[PDB]
Design an enzyme around this catalytic site. Structure first.
Site, PDB file in Angstrom:
ATOM      1  N   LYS A   1       4.617  -1.984   8.381  1.00 55.46           N
ATOM      2  CA  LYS A   1       5.823  -1.394   7.793  1.00 55.46           C
ATOM      3  C   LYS A   1       6.950  -2.393   7.922  1.00 55.46           C
ATOM      4  CE  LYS A   1       7.299   3.002   8.631  1.00 55.46           C
ATOM      5  NZ  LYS A   1       7.927   4.088   9.432  1.00 55.46           N
TER       6      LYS A   1
ATOM      7  N   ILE B   1       0.800  -1.232   0.000  1.00 58.26           N
ATOM      8  CA  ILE B   1       0.000   0.000   0.000  1.00 58.26           C
ATOM      9  C   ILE B   1       0.835   1.284   0.000  1.00 58.26           C
ATOM     10  CG2 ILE B   1      -2.077  -1.039   0.994  1.00 58.26           C
ATOM     11  CD1 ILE B   1      -1.083   0.340   3.723  1.00 58.26           C
ATOM     12  N   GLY B   2       2.142   1.128   0.107  1.00 60.03           N
ATOM     13  CA  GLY B   2       3.040   2.266   0.149  1.00 60.03           C
ATOM     14  C   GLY B   2       4.479   1.807  -0.031  1.00 60.03           C
TER      15      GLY B   2
ATOM     16  N   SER C   1      12.491   4.385  -0.313  1.00 58.08           N
ATOM     17  CA  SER C   1      13.837   3.827  -0.085  1.00 58.08           C
ATOM     18  C   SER C   1      13.911   3.100   1.275  1.00 58.08           C
ATOM     19  CB  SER C   1      14.905   4.934  -0.166  1.00 58.08           C
ATOM     20  N   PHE C   2      13.136   3.595   2.238  1.00 60.00           N
ATOM     21  CA  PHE C   2      13.087   3.037   3.591  1.00 60.00           C
ATOM     22  C   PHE C   2      12.644   1.564   3.627  1.00 60.00           C
ATOM     23  CE2 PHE C   2       8.557   2.811   4.132  1.00 60.00           C
ATOM     24  CZ  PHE C   2       8.036   3.819   3.332  1.00 60.00           C
ATOM     25  N   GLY C   3      11.709   1.213   2.753  1.00 57.39           N
ATOM     26  CA  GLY C   3      11.107  -0.117   2.740  1.00 57.39           C
ATOM     27  C   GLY C   3       9.715  -0.032   2.157  1.00 57.39           C
ATOM     28  N   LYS C   4       8.876  -1.025   2.455  1.00 56.82           N
ATOM     29  CA  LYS C   4       7.508  -1.090   1.919  1.00 56.82           C
ATOM     30  C   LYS C   4       6.463  -1.183   3.034  1.00 56.82           C
ATOM     31  CE  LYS C   4       8.817  -3.271  -2.456  1.00 56.82           C
ATOM     32  NZ  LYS C   4       8.979  -4.553  -3.193  1.00 56.82           N
ATOM     33  N   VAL C   5       5.234  -0.747   2.745  1.00 55.93           N
ATOM     34  CA  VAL C   5       4.122  -0.833   3.702  1.00 55.93           C
ATOM     35  C   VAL C   5       3.013  -1.681   3.101  1.00 55.93           C
ATOM     36  CG1 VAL C   5       2.379   0.415   5.056  1.00 55.93           C
ATOM     37  CG2 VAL C   5       4.658   1.399   4.729  1.00 55.93           C
TER      38      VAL C   5
ATOM     39  N   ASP D   1       7.737  15.231  10.605  1.00 58.35           N
ATOM     40  CA  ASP D   1       7.430  14.819   9.216  1.00 58.35           C
ATOM     41  C   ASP D   1       5.920  14.823   8.933  1.00 58.35           C
ATOM     42  OD1 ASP D   1       8.238  13.858   6.548  1.00 58.35           O
ATOM     43  OD2 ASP D   1       7.639  11.870   7.147  1.00 58.35           O
TER      44      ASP D   1
END
Ligand SMILES: CNS(=O)(=O)c1ccc(N2CCOCC2)c(Nc2ncnc3[nH]cc(Br)c23)c1
Ligand SMILES: CNS(=O)(=O)c1ccc(N2CCOCC2)c(Nc2ncnc3[nH]cc(Br)c23)c1
Lengths: 264, 257
Positions: free
Chosen positions: B39, B18-19, B22-26, B129
């Site tokens: 997350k 769903i998202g 660079s951090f990763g995926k959700v 953020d």
């Protein structure tokens, strides 16, 4: 400290016993600064009270430096942390701060520019090394004066080598995330240059933190009088632009100030 | 972390992504009998930070923590409530739904309450953020603050010649940074427009910070609110309001909607 003792040329290696400490001429949390004598030279000594890494950096930077507008490194003591000390040339004419604000000596335009030019030359030097150096602490205390009115940049205790979603950020957060550049020096310089011309401490009526706050947040800068020459006011306006990238390179500062000396 | 929050990977049923970043995926999914978002990720310090923040959170306008997996770096995962109504950014800019003033203020007040909450904990939290991507909408049009990946706990003479950018860096972050961010969100909400739509993000951040540019306030925005906006995105952090005051004024508006 082992890495440093190996890389620093041995002729710089000093033993504390080779150093004679006379007076204290300056102070701070980091440590104190003595006038003294070393290898038959009159010298200034910075002595220290993460501290290791601060001292190792400062020596690494100083031992690179050779330029007549930058303080002349003589050596350091590297035995152990307790001993730690840094030695440079001594300059009799004292700090620019003193000259302007304590002794309140009244200098003519030519004299002022000579100083401004010499300081700019030192900064140019630093910024254009293979591996550029940021002084990061340029002020009228760290501009020292020869008896003949030439000047040199001193104290590299804050200096650093230059290294090789934002749409919703508060400006101060955006500014934290941006690594500072050699342009920070140009902003400091600008203030110095105004300080010289006016004779006045920047925001004389404010404590340091307040002055920083006004420059930083309220975007205030010292007053620029109509009587200040155009080429200089330009340099000032540009030099203390909040946008670092809009500040001139020192190579141009020099070029312009030397022009003024030709027209002085 | 409180033992009950500990999660094994087997306790988490994954579904669609769903998202990203660079951090990763959700992911959307299922965990401990609830529909969830998951997350999945020096880099370890930041995980404990994010987790140590999330466990503390308990407020209707802030995302609900569910647990996190701690077996090894490869398995790290954070799990929260899933919120069906998507991101505000979407609703406003992709779907482009037309909201009445009331619907807008409801979101604005909700986000403000969540921020108030965070800021007034015993040990306060800066989100660091906030934006229309991290504001999530329930189907009933209430909203929650999300994605605490950048959140920090509030920490408790050379300066005079320092360049601003250097002074800012020797100074500690405050909660007033979130207020600036919120102001933009609030303008974004009322106008339906992305701030500085014509600019890329860094260009925008520069113009706001260096050349003191802000979004334009047209008769599209009401007078009481527009005072808040201007104060909210003040260059001086100290000039910006506290979220408590934001709440008051916005609830006062809701009385009149
Ligand atoms: C070990 N040399 S150094 O470059 O690290 C250094 C750092 C600081 C200072 N003081 C400057 C003035 O504010 C206080 C600190 C000095 N001082 C001086 N160095 C040379 N000749 C000098 N003559 C008079 C003075 Br003061 C003076 C050196
Ligand atoms: C593990 N939860 S978290 O709070 O760390 C978290 C961080 C980021 C996001 N995305 C927000 C939108 O931009 C991309 C990242 C989400 N997403 C969501 N969380 C809940 N319900 C949701 N419904 C729809 C969406 Br997307 C959604 C959660």
């Amino acid at each position: 400290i082992l890495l440093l003792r190996a890389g620093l040329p041995s002729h710089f290696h000093l033993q504390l016993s080779e150093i004679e400490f006379h007076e204290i001429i300056g102070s701070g949390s980091f440590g104190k600064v003595y006038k003294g004598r070393c290898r038959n030279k009159i010298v200034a000594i910075k002595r220290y009270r993460s501290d290791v890494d601060m001292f190792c950096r400062e020596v690494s930077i100083l031992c690179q430096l050779n330029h007549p507008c930058v303080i002349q490194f003589v050596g350091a003591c590297l035995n152990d942390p307790s001993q730690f000390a840094i030695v440079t040339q001594y300059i009799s004419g004292g700090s620019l701060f003193s000259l302007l604000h304590e002794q309140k000596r009244i200098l003519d335009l030519q004299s002022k520019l000579i100083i401004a030019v010499d300081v700019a030359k030192g900064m140019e030097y630093l910024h254009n090394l293979t591996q550029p150096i940021i002084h990061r602490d340029l002020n009228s205390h760290n501009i020292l004066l020869y008896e003949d009115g030439h000047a040199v940049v001193a104290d590299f205790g804050e200096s650093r080598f230059l290294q090789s979603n934002l749409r919703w950020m508060a400006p101060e957060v955006f500014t934290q995330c941006t690594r500072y550049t050699i342009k920070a020096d140009v902003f400091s310089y600008a203030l110095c240059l105004w300080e010289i011309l006016t004779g006045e401490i920047p925001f004389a009526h404010l404590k340091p933190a307040a002055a920083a706050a006004d420059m930083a947040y309220h975007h205030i800068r010292p007053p620029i009088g109509y009587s200040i020459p155009k080429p200089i006011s330009s340099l000032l306006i540009r030099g203390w632009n909040a946008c670092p990238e809009g500040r001139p390179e020192f190579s141009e500062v020099v070029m312009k100030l030397e022009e003024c000396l030709c027209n002085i």
